[PDB]
Design a protein around this nucleic acid. Structure first.
Lengths: 250, 250
DNA sequence: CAACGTTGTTT
DNA sequence: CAACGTTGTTTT
């Protein structure tokens, strides 16, 4: 997808990410770079979103089932990118097609290093081509079986890479969201949907690059029907608008 | 090492190579190209020395435990060598480090074709760096045993290759002697020593590429303490000198 | 990390 | 040779 919501405050988001480690012990993920978390109802590519990844990416002797939550830049910048401005990337890595993921060098190399991450969101927006060229926006989320008390975060399959700015600076962590065919439920809205990891097991297996090979992890990548949506107002169309009105029903 | 002695006449050398085949039957090895054996007390790289190798290198239906003795050129000339004069080779292949042998493509490829051979010598010379001068002291180094009646030949682990002169001629067979760390007994003389195969079992297993894989053969390659030496005169320093005086004690 | 262009070794 | 080290555009 091309737009998400991820508005919850840091403390609330962290509690909504409670998980069981490989011994069945309930835990919260540990933050890296929490100050780069910027809550918004209206996230575009080139902004930072919180993602889950295995602690083994940061500590050599770590339990790969332990989770880090870290803000990462949406728009995978390949490790080999030669220019000094990540936004000057000449091709689009907002998304990564599931069907070609192991063929494309921007995605296959980091995937092969185990750089699998789970992109968090309240949900994603998608636009239906209406006739006129005016498109209708939808907010799309897990069914929620106030509402933001115990909201179920959407967990999208991503790949990340690490890029050292040639002229010096912090290693950039950036991600792409894997896309698949839209399920029947969404097929009238759009032809594509994100690779959604539905439940603790799918999330754990996507993250655990120490225990779960690329072949096994890619079996988790497919359309899913376990999703709902409502139409929203035009307010979300302008990426500068960050209000509860962006995902409010009409 | 960089210098050996191999001075015994062809008939005496062949009797000193008595071995048991795979049925326990005592045999002498069979010569190829005996006329290329030129006995000397003072052998340098690019000269020919007799080596043992499996008969299976020469006959498709042979008992791989049967041994050929054949003169080969010291200084492995890789099969890929493109120039017409083998002495133009820009790499020194007198020796092959045990620790990196599987990383070095000039040694790994022939090793993988089973081109393992046992380099024969009376013994080898090594030069000791004596602190406070650049004048080095030479030693003759041999198996523990005037004494040329029943002398025990030194049996060093070698790899060989086959090079066709591009402009035509006989296939060249050339060898490298594998090197390892010097044992404690020799550590004051030099930091390196040849890979010595101590006894009939080590020799048989190094030769038998039909029955003993690369992994198993490489377990035979290590420092050994079963070695003695004496200092010799400067006469051996000049590689043109071929006299009994080269390995005579002082 | 599959494709591709280069190089090969020790004291 | 063939094993090395080096290279590198993507989606709706």
């Amino acid at each position: 997808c091309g737009r998400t919501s991820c508005h919850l405050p840091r403390d609330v988001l962290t509690r909504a990410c409670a998980y069981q480690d490989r011994r069945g012990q309930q835990r919260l993920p540990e933050w890296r770079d929490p100050d780069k978390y910027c809550p918004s109802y209206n996230k575009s590519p080139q902004s930072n979103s919180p993602v889950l990844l295995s602690r083994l990416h940061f500590e050599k002797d770590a339990d790969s089932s332990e989770r880090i939550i870290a803000p990462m830049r949406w728009g995978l910048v390949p490790s080999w990118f030669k220019e000094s401005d990540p936004s000057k990337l000449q091709f689009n890595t907002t998304n990564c097609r599931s069907d070609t993921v192991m063929e494309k060098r921007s995605f296959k190399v980091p995937l092969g290093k185990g750089r699998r991450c789970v992109v968090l969101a309240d949900g994603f927006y998608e636009w239906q081509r209406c006739g006129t060229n005016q498109r209708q926006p939808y907010f799309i989320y897990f069914p929620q079986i106030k509402v933001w008390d115990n909201w179920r975060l959407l967990t999208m399959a991503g790949i990340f890479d690490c890029w050292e700015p040639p002229e010096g600076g912090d290693v950039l962590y950036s991600y792409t969201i894997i896309t698949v065919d839209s399920c029947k439920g969404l097929s009238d809205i759009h032809h594509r949907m994100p690779a959604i990891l539905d439940g603790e097991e799918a999330v754990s297996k996507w993250l655990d690059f120490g225990e779960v090979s690329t072949q096994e992890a890619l079996k988790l990548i497919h359309p899913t029907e376990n999703i709902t949506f409502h139409a929203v107002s035009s307010v979300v169309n302008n990426s500068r608008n960050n209000t509860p009105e962006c995902l409010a029903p009409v």
